[PDB]
Design a protein around this ligand. Sequence first.
Ligand code: CA
Ligand code: CA
Length: 275
Amino acid sequence: AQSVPYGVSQIKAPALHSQGYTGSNVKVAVIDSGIDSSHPDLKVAGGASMVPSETNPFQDNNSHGTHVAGTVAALNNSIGVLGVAPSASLYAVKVLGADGSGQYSWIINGIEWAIANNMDVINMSLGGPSGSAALKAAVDKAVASGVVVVAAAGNEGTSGSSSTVGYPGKYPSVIAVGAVDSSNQRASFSSVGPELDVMAPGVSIQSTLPGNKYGAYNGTXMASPHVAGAAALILSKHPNWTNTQVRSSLENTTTKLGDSFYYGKGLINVQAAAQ
Ligand SMILES: [Ca+2]
Ligand SMILES: [Ca+2]
């Protein structure tokens, strides 16, 4: 049997699936630690590894990439979970090693690859406290090229009134996603600040893990694939739209929760955003 994780329903994704919008033919690059393509509940369409030492993008020795990928597109079937856009074309862009670490230039090469290969959506469920002009240049190039870019806001919590959003989420061109639980309460670790654009479910997120397992993780990095998958359903309904319209729809149709400093524009609602 298959279970629909609570967050897939909380952002109102089943509504569009009922209407026949499941993300078909939309291409989503999951820039992360790889995706185990043999998981029976994932179908991976391609990818490329930027990590020198682990040249196979379909080998996820860390787990993070496979989990993020499952939230974006776990298949609709009799097993496991269901993704926000279960028919999306999933591409594993490996920029992080088995220890979950990455050099910014591997990350930039990942993004360049995504641009060259005409990705529609890029998900970066990763963040550092530092940025680099090269990193802003790659992210801004992607958005200029018409790609929807979504990134985890960071799991740094509150530092009084200091913004704690990390990079690349802190860049205006990137949609920075924070984490709420089932009751739309901000998770204590979720980074806060003026650069936070929307919130998605990020606490006890059941998704796929390497070796035909499933498991629940917490993080803004679990919030982010929910908004990348929502960008994929909007475009499967309106193939038509630019990354600028998809971003605006997501931001303008949110359920406003508390203060923007903590919640940005609020909880995305992809049924309202897809028009
Ligand atoms: Ca499934
Ligand atoms: Ca931003």
